[PDB]
Amino acid sequence: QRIAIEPIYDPSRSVWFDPDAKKYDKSDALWAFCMYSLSPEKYEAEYGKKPPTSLDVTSMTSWEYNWFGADVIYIAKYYEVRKESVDVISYRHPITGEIATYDSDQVEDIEDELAIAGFHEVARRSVKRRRVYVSVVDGDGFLEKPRRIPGEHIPLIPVYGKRWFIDDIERVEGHIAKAMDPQRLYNLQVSMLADTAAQDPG
Amino acid sequence: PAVMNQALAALLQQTSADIQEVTGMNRADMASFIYLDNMAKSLKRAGEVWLSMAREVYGSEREVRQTGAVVALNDLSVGRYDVTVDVGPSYTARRDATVSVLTNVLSSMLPT
Amino acid sequence: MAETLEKKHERIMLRFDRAYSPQKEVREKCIEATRFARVPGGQWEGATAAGTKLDEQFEKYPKFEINKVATELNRIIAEYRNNRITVKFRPGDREASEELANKLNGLFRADYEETDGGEACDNAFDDAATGGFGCFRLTSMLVRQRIAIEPIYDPSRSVWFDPDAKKYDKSDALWAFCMYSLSPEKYEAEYGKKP
Amino acid sequence: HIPLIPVYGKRWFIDDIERVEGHIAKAMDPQRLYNLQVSMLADTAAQDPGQIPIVGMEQIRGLEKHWEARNKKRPAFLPLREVRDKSGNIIAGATPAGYTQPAVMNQALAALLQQTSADIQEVTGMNRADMASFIYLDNMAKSLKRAGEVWLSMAREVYGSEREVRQTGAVVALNDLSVGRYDVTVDVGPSYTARRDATVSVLTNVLSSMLPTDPMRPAIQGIILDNIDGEGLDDFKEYNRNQLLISGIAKPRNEKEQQIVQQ
Amino acid sequence: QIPIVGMEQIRGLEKHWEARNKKRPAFLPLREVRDKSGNIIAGATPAGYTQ
Amino acid sequence: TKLDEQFEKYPKFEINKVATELNRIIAEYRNNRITVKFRPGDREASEELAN
Numbered sequence: 001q002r003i004a005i006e007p008i009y010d011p012s013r014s015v016w017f018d019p020d021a022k023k024y025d026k027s028d029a030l031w032a033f034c035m036y037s038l039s040p041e042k043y044e045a046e047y048g049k050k051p052p053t054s055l056d057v058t059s060m061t062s063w064e065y066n067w068f069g070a071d072v073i074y075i076a077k078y079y080e081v082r083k084e085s086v087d088v089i090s091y092r093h094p095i096t097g098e099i100a101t102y103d104s105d106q107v108e109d110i111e112d113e114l115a116i117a118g119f120h121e122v123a124r125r126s127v128k129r130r131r132v133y134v135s136v137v138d139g140d141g142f143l144e145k146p147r148r149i150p151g152e153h154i155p156l157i158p159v160y161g162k163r164w165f166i167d168d169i170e171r172v173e174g175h176i177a178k179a180m181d182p183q184r185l186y187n188l189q190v191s192m193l194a195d196t197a198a199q200d201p202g
Numbered sequence: 203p204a205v206m207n208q209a210l211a212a213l214l215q216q217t218s219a220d221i222q223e224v225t226g227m228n229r230a231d232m233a234s235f236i237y238l239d240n241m242a243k244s245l246k247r248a249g250e251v252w253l254s255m256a257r258e259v260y261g262s263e264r265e266v267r268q269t270g271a272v273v274a275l276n277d278l279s280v281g282r283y284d285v286t287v288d289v290g291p292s293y294t295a296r297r298d299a300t301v302s303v304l305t306n307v308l309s310s311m312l313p314t
Numbered sequence: 315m316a317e318t319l320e321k322k323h324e325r326i327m328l329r330f331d332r333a334y335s336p337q338k339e340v341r342e343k344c345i346e347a348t349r350f351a352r353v354p355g356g357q358w359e360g361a362t363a364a365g366t367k368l369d370e371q372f373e374k375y376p377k378f379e380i381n382k383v384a385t386e387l388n389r390i391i392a393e394y395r396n397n398r399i400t401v402k403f404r405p406g407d408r409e410a411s412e413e414l415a416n417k418l419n420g421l422f423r424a425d426y427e428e429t430d431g432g433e434a435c436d437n438a439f440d441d442a443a444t445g446g447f448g449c450f451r452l453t454s455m456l457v458r459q460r461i462a463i464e465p466i467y468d469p470s471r472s473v474w475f476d477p478d479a480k481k482y483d484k485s486d487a488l489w490a491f492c493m494y495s496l497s498p499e500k501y502e503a504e505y506g507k508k509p
Numbered sequence: 510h511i512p513l514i515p516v517y518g519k520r521w522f523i524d525d526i527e528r529v530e531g532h533i534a535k536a537m538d539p540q541r542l543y544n545l546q547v548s549m550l551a552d553t554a555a556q557d558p559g560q561i562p563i564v565g566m567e568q569i570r571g572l573e574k575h576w577e578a579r580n581k582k583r584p585a586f587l588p589l590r591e592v593r594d595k596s597g598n599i600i601a602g603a604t605p606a607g608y609t610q611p612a613v614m615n616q617a618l619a620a621l622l623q624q625t626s627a628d629i630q631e632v633t634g635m636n637r638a639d640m641a642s643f644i645y646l647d648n649m650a651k652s653l654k655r656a657g658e659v660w661l662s663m664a665r666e667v668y669g670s671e672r673e674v675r676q677t678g679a680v681v682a683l684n685d686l687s688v689g690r691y692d693v694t695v696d697v698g699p700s701y702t703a704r705r706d707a708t709v710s711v712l713t714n715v716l717s718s719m720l721p722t723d724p725m726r727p728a729i730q731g732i733i734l735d736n737i738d739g740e741g742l743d744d745f746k747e748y749n750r751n752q753l754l755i756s757g758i759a760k761p762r763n764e765k766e767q768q769i770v771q772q
Numbered sequence: 773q774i775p776i777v778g779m780e781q782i783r784g785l786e787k788h789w790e791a792r793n794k795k796r797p798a799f800l801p802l803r804e805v806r807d808k809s810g811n812i813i814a815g816a817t818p819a820g821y822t823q
Numbered sequence: 824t825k826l827d828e829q830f831e832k833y834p835k836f837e838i839n840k841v842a843t844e845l846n847r848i849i850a851e852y853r854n855n856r857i858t859v860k861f862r863p864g865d866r867e868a869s870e871e872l873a874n
Binding site: 223229231 | 389
C-alpha cells in the first residue's frame with residue numbers, strides 16, 4: 001500500500017466544499033465534491049455497459065466559448081465524514097512489553113495469525129471515532145458504493161492566491177483581475193486608431 | 203490626411219502606464235511574496251493530512267532504531283508524535299539536503 | 315425567572331440593542347472600506363445601475379475600475395507576514411522563575427501550533443489593516459482539557475461590547491456578543507428539530 | 510476575563526464613541542473621482558474618431574463612385590462641382606465646404622487626472638518609525654499582550670498551579686489557590702516554529718558581536734551546532750557532543766557518557 | 773464638442789449624421805443657409821461648436 | 824455593421840501586456856520550490872523519528 005499525491009485539473013469548476021467551512025484550509029468541513037470529465041468509451045471500460053450515462057450539470061462553461069465535443073460525461077467524487085462506533089479489542093500481550101494495545105475492529109478480520117502470541121484480555125471497550133468515506137456518483141445513481149479511506153481528514157488541499165471572507169462568502173483574487181479594464185481599453189484604442197489611419201493615406 | 207485626435211493619444215499613454223502600476227525587507231518588497239506565503243500554509247496542511255494518513259498505512263513507530271509493524275497493523279493509544287510540521291527547500295536526494303546545510307554552517311566560520 | 319423562564323431573555327435582547335446603537339455608523343465605514351478594496355466591482359457600489367433613456371432604451375454609463383489603493387495595503391500586510399511576533403513570558407528575579415518561564419512559554423507554543431493560532435492572527439491583522447477592526451477568540455476545547463485559539467470572521471458585524479468599556483483591550487466590560495451565521499441543515503444537526 | 514481579544518488599526522475616543530480607521534478610508538474620494546475621469550474620457554474619445562468631408566447633395570451627385578474608392582485606386586484627381594445659387598451664378602468653389610472635428614480632451618479633465626493620481630500616493634504612505642506600517646505593528650503587540658494575560662489567567666484552571674520545592678503540577682485535576690501571582694512578565698518577541706530556532710537565533714545574536722578572542726566563542730559555536738541540523742548529521746553531531754562534554758560544558762545526562770567517556 | 777446647425781439645414785438627413793461613427797461614410801451631406809427670399813447667405817458647414 | 828448590405832466585422836487587435844508579471848511570479852516559484860520539513864522535538868528519540 002502507498003500514499004500518492006495527484007494533481008487536480010480545472011479546480012475552479014471542479015471542487016466544491018461544504019458552505020459551512022470558513023477556515024483557510026477547510027478543516028471544519030463535513031463533505032466535498034471533486035468533478036472530472038470523461039469520455040463515453042472510458043465510461044464503457046469500467047462501470048460496465050450501463051445506460052447511456054447521466055452527467056452532472058452546472059451551467060457554468062461555454063460562457064463565451066465554442067463547443068464541439070459531445071465527450072462530456074461529468075462524474076464526481078463525494079467525501080463524507082461520519083462518527084460511527086468502533087470496538088477496540090486490544091491484544092495487550094504481556095510479553096515483549098506491549099502495554100495498551102490497539103486491535104481496532106478492522107485489524108482482526110484482516111490480521112488472521114490465529115492469535116499466536118497476543119492473548120485477548122480486556123477487549124470490550126467501544127469508542128466513537130472519526131472516519132471518512134468516498135463514493136462515485138453521477139446524475140442517475142451510484143457508480144461505486146461508499147467505502148472508507150485510510151485517514152481522518154478530507155484529502156483535498158486548497159491553494160489560494162489571496163483569500164478573504166467578506167459577507168458570509170469567501171472571496172479570492174489572482175494577479176490579473178485588477179488589470180482587465182485598462183488592457184481591454186488599450187486594445188480598443190489601438191484598433192480604432194489603425195483603421196482611421198488606413199482610411200485616408202495621402 | 204488622417205489626424206489622430208488628442209484624446210486617443212492621451213488614453214494610449216494613460217492605459218499603458220496604468221497596466222504597469224496596477225500589477226507590481228528585500229523579500230517583502232517583491233510582488234510575489236503573498237503567493238509564496240500562502241503556498242507554505244497549504245503545504246503545512248498537506249503535511250498534517252499525510253501524517254494522519256500514514257499511521258494507518260505504514261503503522262505506528264514506537265520505541266524501546268525505528269521499527270514499525272509486522273504484516274499490517276496500526277497500534278493505537280501511542281499518542282501524538284514529537285515532530286512539528288514546517289516548510290523548507292525541496293531536494294531531489296538526501297545528499298543535497300546534507301551538503302546544503304553543512305555548507306551554510308561553513309562560510310560563517312573564521313578559519314580557525 | 316431564568317433558564318426556561320425567559321425573563322432573562324428580554325434583558326439579553328435589550329442589552330443587544332443598547333450595544334448595537336452607538337457603534338452603528340462606525341462599523342458601516344469599516345465594511346464599506348473592506349468591500350471597496352477587495353470586492354471586484356465594489357468601487358462603484360451605490361450607482362451600479364445608472365443611465366438614461368436614450369431614445370426609449372436604457373443604456374447605462376460605462377463604469378471602469380482601476381484599483382490603485384491596494385498596493386500599499388499589500389505592502390503593509392507583507393511586512394507583518396514576514397515578521398510575525400508572538401508572546402514571550404519574560405522571567406523575574408527569583409530562584410526558580412527561569413524554569414517557570416521556560417515551561418510557560420513552551421506550553422503556549424504547544425497551544426498555538428496545534429490549533430488555529432496562525433490563521434487567527436493573520437486574519438485579525440488583515441482585517442485590522444484593511445477596515446480598522448479585527449478580533450480573535452480564545453476558547454477551551456475538550457481533547458483531557460486544552461486551551462485553543464480560534465479565528466473570528468467578519469468582526470465588524472459580529473462582535474459587540476458593553477458600551478461602558480473605554481479601554482483599548484475592553485478590560486472593564488461586563489458582557490459581549492459574538493454572532494455567527496449558520497445553515498438550516500446544521501441547525502437541524504444539533505439544537506434538535508426545533509421550531 | 511472575557512476571552513475576546515480585539516485588534517485595531519488606529520483607535521481613538523472622541524465623543525463618548527470609539528472611532529477606528531484602517532489604511533484605505535482616507536483615499537476613497539480621489540480614487541472614485543479618478544475612475545469617473547477615465548470613464549468620461551473613454552467614450553468622449555470613442556464618439557468622434559476622425560474627419561469626414563461635408564458637401565452639398567447636388568455638388569457630388571453622379572460622382573460618388575470616384576470618392577468612394579479614393580483609397581484603393583490611385584486617381585490622378587478627384588472631380589467636384591461648384592456651388593450655384595437659384596439663378597445659376599457661382600458663389601463658391603469646388604472644394605468641400607468643411608470637415609468635422611475630432612475629439613478634444615478638455616483641460617480640466619487632464620488636470621484632475623494628474624491631481625488625483627498624485628493625491629492617492631500622497632495620502633497612502635528611526636528606520637522603523639519612518640515606515641507606514643509601524644502603527645499597525647505596534648497596535649498588534651499590545652493586543653498580543655492582552656491575549657497573554659487572558660491565557661495565563663485561564664491556564665491555571667486547566668493545567669493547575671505550578672509551585673516549586675522543576676515545575677510539577679496537579680495529580681488528577683486541581684488548581685491550588687493562595688499561591689499568588691507568578692513571577693513572570695508578558696512581552697512580545699519573534700514567533701518560532703520550534704524551540705531549536707529560538708535557541709540558535711539568540712545564540713547567534715550573542716555571537717557576531719564578539720571579537721575573535723577569549724574562550725567563549727568556541728563554546729558558543731559548540732552550543733549552536735549541538736542544536737539545529739537535519740538529515741544525515743548523526744556522526745558529525747556525535748563527534749561535536751563528545752568534544753563538548755570532555756571540555757566540561759555539556760553536563761553528561763547520567764546515562765552512559767558520565768561513566769565511559771567522561772571517566 | 774457638439775456641432776450646432778439650423779433646423780431647416782439638416783431636416784431629412786439626420787440618419788446620416790447619427791451613424792457617422794459606426795458606418796464609414798464617404799462624405800456627409802448638408803444644406804446651405806437661405807434667407808426669406810431664397811438667397812444663399814452662408815455655406816454648408818455647421819455654424820459652430822460648443823466649448 | 825451592415826455597411827451596404829454586408830456584415831464586415833470590426834477589427835479586434837490583441838496586444839497582451841498583462842502576462843509578463845505573471846510569468847515573472849511563476850518563474851520565482853519554479854526557481855525555489857519548497858516542501859514539507861518535519862522538524863524534530865525535545866526528546867531522546869525524536870531525531871531518528873523526524874529523519
